[PDB]
Amino acid sequence: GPEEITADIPNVGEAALSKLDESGIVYIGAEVTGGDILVGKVTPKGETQLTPEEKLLRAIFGEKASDVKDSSLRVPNGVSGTVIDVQVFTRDGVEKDKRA
Amino acid sequence: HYIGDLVQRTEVELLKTPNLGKKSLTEIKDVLASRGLSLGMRLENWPPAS
Amino acid sequence: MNKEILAVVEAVSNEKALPREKIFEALESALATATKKKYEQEIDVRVQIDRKSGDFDTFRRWLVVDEVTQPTKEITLEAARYEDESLNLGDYVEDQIESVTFDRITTQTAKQVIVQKVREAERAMVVDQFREHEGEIITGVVKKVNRDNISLDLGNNAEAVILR
Amino acid sequence: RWLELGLTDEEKQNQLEQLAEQYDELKHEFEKKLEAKRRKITQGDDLAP
Amino acid sequence: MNLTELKNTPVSELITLGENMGLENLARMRKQDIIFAILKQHAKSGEDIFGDGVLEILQDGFGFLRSADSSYLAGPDDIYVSPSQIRRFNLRTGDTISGKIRPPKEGERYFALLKVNEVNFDKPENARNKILFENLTPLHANSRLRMERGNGSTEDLTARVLDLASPIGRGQRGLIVAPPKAGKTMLLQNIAQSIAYNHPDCVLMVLLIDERPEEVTEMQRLVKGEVVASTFDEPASRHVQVAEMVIEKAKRLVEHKKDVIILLDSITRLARAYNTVVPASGKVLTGGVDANALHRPKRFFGAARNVEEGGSLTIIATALIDTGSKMDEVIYEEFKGTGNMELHLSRKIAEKRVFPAIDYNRSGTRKEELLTTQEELQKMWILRKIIHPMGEIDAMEFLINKLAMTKTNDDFFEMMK
Amino acid sequence: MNLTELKNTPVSELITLGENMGLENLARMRKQDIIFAILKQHAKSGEDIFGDGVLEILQDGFGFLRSADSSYLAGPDDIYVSPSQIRRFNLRTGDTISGKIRPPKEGERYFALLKVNEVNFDKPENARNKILFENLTPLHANSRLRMERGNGSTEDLTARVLDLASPIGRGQRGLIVAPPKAGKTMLLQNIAQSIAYNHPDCVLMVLLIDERPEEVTEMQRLVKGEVVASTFDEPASRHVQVAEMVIEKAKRLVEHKKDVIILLDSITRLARAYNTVVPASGKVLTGGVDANALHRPKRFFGAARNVEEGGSLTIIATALIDTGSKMDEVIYEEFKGTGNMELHLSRKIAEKRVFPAIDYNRSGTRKEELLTTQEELQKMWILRKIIHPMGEIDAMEFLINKLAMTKTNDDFFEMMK
Numbered sequence A: 001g002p003e004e005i006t007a008d009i010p011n012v013g014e015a016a017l018s019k020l021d022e023s024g025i026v027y028i029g030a031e032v033t034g035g036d037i038l039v040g041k042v043t044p045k046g047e048t049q050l051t052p053e054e055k056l057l058r059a060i061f062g063e064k065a066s067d068v069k070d071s072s073l074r075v076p077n078g079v080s081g082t083v084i085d086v087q088v089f090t091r092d093g094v095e096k097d098k099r100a
Numbered sequence B: 001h002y003i004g005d006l007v008q009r010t011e012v013e014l015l016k017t018p019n020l021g022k023k024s025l026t027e028i029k030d031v032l033a034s035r036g037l038s039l040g041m042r043l044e045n046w047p048p049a050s
Numbered sequence C: 001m002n003k004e005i006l007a008v009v010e011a012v013s014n015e016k017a018l019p020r021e022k023i024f025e026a027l028e029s030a031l032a033t034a035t036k037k038k039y040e041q042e043i044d045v046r047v048q049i050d051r052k053s054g055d056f057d058t059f060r061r062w063l064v065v066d067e068v069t070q071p072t073k074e075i076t077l078e079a080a081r082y083e084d085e086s087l088n089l090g091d092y093v094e095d096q097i098e099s100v101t102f103d104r105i106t107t108q109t110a111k112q113v114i115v116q117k118v119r120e121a122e123r124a125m126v127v128d129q130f131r132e133h134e135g136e137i138i139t140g141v142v143k144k145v146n147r148d149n150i151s152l153d154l155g156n157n158a159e160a161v162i163l164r
Numbered sequence D: 001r002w003l004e005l006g007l008t009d010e011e012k013q014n015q016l017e018q019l020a021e022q023y024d025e026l027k028h029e030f031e032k033k034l035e036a037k038r039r040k041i042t043q044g045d046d047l048a049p
Numbered sequence E, F: 001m002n003l004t005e006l007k008n009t010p011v012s013e014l015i016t017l018g019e020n021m022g023l024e025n026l027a028r029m030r031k032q033d034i035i036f037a038i039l040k041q042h043a044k045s046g047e048d049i050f051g052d053g054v055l056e057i058l059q060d061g062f063g064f065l066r067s068a069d070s071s072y073l074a075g076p077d078d079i080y081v082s083p084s085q086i087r088r089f090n091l092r093t094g095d096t097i098s099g100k101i102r103p104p105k106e107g108e109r110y111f112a113l114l115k116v117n118e119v120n121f122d123k124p125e126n127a128r129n130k131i132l133f134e135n136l137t138p139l140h141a142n143s144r145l146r147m148e149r150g151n152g153s154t155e156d157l158t159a160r161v162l163d164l165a166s167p168i169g170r171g172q173r174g175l176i177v178a179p180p181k182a183g184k185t186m187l188l189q190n191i192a193q194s195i196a197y198n199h200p201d202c203v204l205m206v207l208l209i210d211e212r213p214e215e216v217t218e219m220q221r222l223v224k225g226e227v228v229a230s231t232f233d234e235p236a237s238r239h240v241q242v243a244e245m246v247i248e249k250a251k252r253l254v255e256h257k258k259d260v261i262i263l264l265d266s267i268t269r270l271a272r273a274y275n276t277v278v279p280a281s282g283k284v285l286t287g288g289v290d291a292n293a294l295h296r297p298k299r300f301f302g303a304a305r306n307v308e309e310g311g312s313l314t315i316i317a318t319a320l321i322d323t324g325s326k327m328d329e330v331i332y333e334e335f336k337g338t339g340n341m342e343l344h345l346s347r348k349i350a351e352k353r354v355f356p357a358i359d360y361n362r363s364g365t366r367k368e369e370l371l372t373t374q375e376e377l378q379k380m381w382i383l384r385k386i387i388h389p390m391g392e393i394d395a396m397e398f399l400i401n402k403l404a405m406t407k408t409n410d411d412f413f414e415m416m417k
Ligand SMILES: Nc1ncnc2c1ncn2[C@@H]1O[C@H](COP(=O)(O)OP(=O)(O)O)[C@@H](O)[C@H]1O
Pocket: E155, E158, E179, E180, E181, E182, E183, E184, E185, E186, E187, E355, E356, F366, F367, F368
């Protein structure tokens, strides 16, 4: 399965995920001090059968996200700063997300 | 042209003036709410000293 | 966005314990608290989304009363004869449109409200289904026996309690 | 919004229609540039195989 | 400004007014948005607006006041009324409202109501505590509707024969059973003319469903009363809409103690439109007819009655038969023992250029003793017993020759002795 | 350069012109792109282009001007017109436009309009402030269309019998009810020939929907007026496209005070195509027919009327029956009480080599008093009363023998006395 940038990141509190939007990317202008999440990337480490009804159920109910691996990129340790710009490039066929 | 001349009156006359819609009325009422005072009061000391 | 609201209302988990009008009212309350969190003031607003297909068209409640406290939801009786109100309570007018019902905090509060509403719905359903067996005897395994009371499995999401 | 009137047709209307045609050509060229910039900044980019 | 002056005025005066107001090019759009923009401009430079119409309450909660000339159709000309009026004055669907209205701001486009003035031609105080329609006690017709004008024209003899065959009264149900090609249009036209000339106090309403538009325009300005019609040009949704509109208007008017008279043509086409508009219930007979599909038409025909408290409602719906299909046939079978006054118009006499083609042998009316006097009824029975052994065309020409010489049915009866 | 000279010219002269211009191998492609490249070359070496056609406005905002010979189909020959013209001249769908056009540069491929010259055969100033179609007041037909030519040929007697059975006028609705195998094609051809020979001032339009292509090509160059036809070769999308095209053209022409006459064949096939092209609404009767699927055809048949202000529109749509399916049957039932002039052509007389097979007993026209004089109507009624007791084949041969000797219907009537 292909990896996605959905805002469904398990094994993390909502306070750490508050810096991201509904599309899983930090808002333009949100500073970060230490190692924190800025892009909500997840990859399916399992098999098929990922149905949209299951997606909307897991978004509200159900157990944790089964196949994610938490492949989301975080800012390296020690380096700080304030985000000022985000760029996105998408392959043809793939629909652009709301931030794009 | 003065705030005190507006605090001591209700908005029944505000809607009587044309071009006074939801925008202006809501803006004035929310500004006076953020300022704590109420639209429509009763005071006699006016205007000191103008 | 309306397509997603549809997908949600038609793709609910418990179509029986959560009827369609219940999904409508739950989404309305979720979007209402979202719009409440939007503005810095406190103003109660319902969305009245088209139950069948269409999108939302919010309103603005104003609570006709001679008071002035929180004037965002205040309309005096004397200064209300315009717009043919002529009433004492129920001035829920359409002064407010342009609700955003898909951003991050709105989605989170909507998910929370939906969880609360489905919990309330399943509670009401189990209670008014298994209350008919009030005089007769009920059989069922015990979920868990606590100190103050014990809770019992009676069936599909069926709970009973026996006091200490 | 009312560029078009009628008086002394034989030459006044000829000049007015020439001007209106120039205006329409300018508007079409501007819409063309708009659409070209749109399809250039919205075309899907190539990233990697 | 009042609404009806701009509604029932020709569109040319509206074009002139809109051009004089210094507005956009007005003649390029519908009459609806034309008058909408005209009212908006007159409100921007002028006083409050004065509107009127009939009220329809949707499943949404609010109400729409629609005009009579557009057959109560949606558009910019409708009047939005909030549920607050429906809670204060306790409004109902079909309420004839007339009052003050205001222009719309952002978020709205319809003229909102400001203050009602006349509700069903009555004061809101008197209309507050009233009696419902279904709560009334139906009865038989007692006051007979005189259809003879007295002049004895070339065609009023038709109406005369009608008085000879079907005494109509306030609260009776009339079913005109006639195949096509038979000449019922001018018959109903003359009936409406006579009933408006003899009884101008009672409201008169006609309804043309699935009818040709030319007949609609030639009837909407030839007879009295609002001529509401839903031609075949529109789907069945508009037909059921106007059916509910007219039936609720009649119910409200008879609740306000007014003698209401409905002329419906034809009832088979209305029932067919009902059948195709309401969802199916699974059970289907021959001809593509559903079981519940006739429930609403039946109700519509059963609304007519003679109220004991005040006023009455008399419907006259014609049933089109002999078309080849089974829909009309099963409709006429279901409505056969329904109306208490049938009038049969056989095409055999119509094709022979003998008008009015009236099957006097098969026509009749029940409880006619409560509409005519004693000797009048005796003469009618004598005439019936005399004509019954005769056929149809011969009896028709005999009646025509015996009625052409006389001018009044009374002299006719005494000369027939 | 004008467009019509290159449109209605044979393709051979186009091949010669393209070979003389020193171009690519031209005969290897469609006529459409052939004439497109020819116009492009003539514009590269020459003056402005002069085009014409009928305008269609999409849901996109712009407009396409399409020619009559391609049945108004998409291709390189269309003319793109910006919404700026639709805002300035306030254009509408179906506007007959003719004017100057320019070649396209990069980003474009259609010839863009430069300046309109003739809009619906009228000046833009006169067409600016006008009257809408639906805003007109329909009426009954007053001017009768004379179908007798006077020569009395071997086949014009058909038209004569038509004048004997269905007096056609400006604003009437004609429904030809005939099973297959019955000979209606040459009937409509002769009707068109006679109505163009007797009334050459009024525009004549024919429409062949779901028809064989050979008949299309043999009719497109035998009768007058643009012969627009959508054969069965294409899906129903093109059928509804050409239906809207022709109906909007007729509406614009009658708005410009022109007597428009439409010949539509057949209406059952057009309604079937409508049924399969418009999305379903859930409700379905027997035969695979939807409720709203007949709304647009109904409208199409209801567009015809007699305008009181100026001009009129007369449609003559034939209904194909007796095919076995239920679609045609339910269509003919829905359109039975729709047209005000039916003409029945029974196959029993057609199979006996007795033409024209016309069911005179079941045929007729309403309000014929407004089309014929007094003694003419009296003679027609006498003839109807005489022929009615007879059957179909015997009456048909009697009428044929009585009409072959005479040359004019007047002498026929006086000799029938
Ligand atoms: N009372 C009458 N006197 C003279 N002619 C009549 C009379 N009633 C009907 N007709 C004739 O019969 C025809 C009926 O036409 P129409 O109203 O279309 O039929 P229907 O009423 O069956 O729909 C008319 O053309 C008219 O000439």
